[PDB]
């Protein structure tokens, strides 16, 4: 049967636990990303010389 | 002074994700919006699981 789940906010950063133990909002990798409270995942602000 | 009390039903037709409803008023009369509500036809092809 067709099933569907959505992850409202990718705000959990990364987790090093097995995938069966992770929260839906935690990923595996997140490099140069910003976890905003109201804008979700963003690129980190650019490095200004 | 013309003051109304009750419910005003108006058509909001189409996809809920693409319907912007806003209330404008620039008159000298008061407004007291108690609440609102909507009805629509909802269907999902998959279960919440």
């Amino acid at each position: 049967a067709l099933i569907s789940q959505s992850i409202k906010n990718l705000k959990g950063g990364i987790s090093q636990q097995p995938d069966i133990l992770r929260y839906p909002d935690q990923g595996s990798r997140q490099v140069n990303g910003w976890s905003s409270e109201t804008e979700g995942l963003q690129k980190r602000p650019p490095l200004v010389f | 002074l013309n003051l109304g009390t009750g419910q005003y039903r108006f058509p909001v037709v189409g996809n809920a994700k693409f319907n912007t409803v806003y209330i404008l008023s620039d008159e000298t009369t008061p407004l007291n919006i108690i609440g609102c509500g909507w009805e629509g036809n909802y269907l999902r092809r998959s279960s919440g699981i």
Binding site: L2, S6, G12, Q17, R22, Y23, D25, Q26 | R44, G48
Partner: peptide, 15 residues
């Protein structure tokens, strides 16, 4: 009428 997604406040950290 297909079932709805269960409202999960969920959490964070180690589980």
């Amino acid at each position: 009428k297909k079932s709805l997604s269960v409202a999960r406040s969920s959490g964070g950290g180690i589980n």
